Write a protein that binds this ligand. Structure first.
Ligand SMILES: [Mg+2]
Lengths: 64, 140
């Protein structure tokens, strides 16, 4: 039974570690989502400023 | 110049209610003695000033973290013509609580479907002539 119990302990530890892995996976995924939303925001602003600076550069070189 | 405000906004279609979350604020100007103010945020629906929601008062921080949530039981049809107001106030025990800042969000510019959460710069609240009447006549 020592063979079996030893293994039992192993499976229990694996269980705990798996639970922790679950929590970590949840935090991971959530923060990944939020960061993705933030990146979307960044690309919106970056395109806005791209247009801004293109138009501004054209208007600036226009008076030359 | 007072500072910025991080907030969250989304709509629950299952209960037909607006979920407004006050996350935090940053770089708020100091108006109190210790070098830091006592800030608290008043949030209410912009269209009608009824049932305004107030957060808990944080003591002496120019970067207060509220992480609070408020629910506005408003249908989705009426929501479109309704605005949100988030004003930052400074608490004072012996006088009028001065307004630090304010921010207004039109619900026609807001896009629901994805959970929104952003930082927006605070501005100074508006204080025009009271009468607003006019008289017309002819001179000859
Ligand atoms: Mg005070």
């Amino acid at each position: 039974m020592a063979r079996e119990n030893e293994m039992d302990e192993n499976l229990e530890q694996v269980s705990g570690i798996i639970g922790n892995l679950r929590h970590m996976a949840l935090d991971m995924g959530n923060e990944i989502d939020t960061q993705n939303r933030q990146i979307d925001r960044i690309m919106e602003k970056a395109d806005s400023n791209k247009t801004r600076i293109d138009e501004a550069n054209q208007r600036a070189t226009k008076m030359l | 110049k007072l500072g910025k405000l991080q907030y969250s906004l989304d709509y629950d279609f299952q209960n037909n209610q607006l979920l407004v979350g006050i996350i935090q604020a940053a770089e708020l100007p100091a108006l109190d003695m210790g070098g830091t103010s006592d800030p608290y945020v008043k949030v209410f629906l912009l269209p009608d000033k009824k049932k305004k929601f107030e957060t808990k008062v944080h003591r002496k921080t120019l970067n207060p973290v509220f992480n609070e949530q408020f629910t506005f039981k408003v249908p989705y049809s009426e929501l479109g013509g309704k605005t949100l107001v988030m004003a930052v106030y400074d608490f004072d025990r012996f006088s009028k609580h001065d307004i630090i800042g304010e921010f207004k969000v039109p619900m026609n510019t807001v896009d629901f479907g994805h959970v929104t959460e952003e930082w927006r710069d605070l501005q100074s609240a508006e204080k025009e002539q009271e009468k607003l009447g006019d008289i017309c006549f002819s001179l000859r």
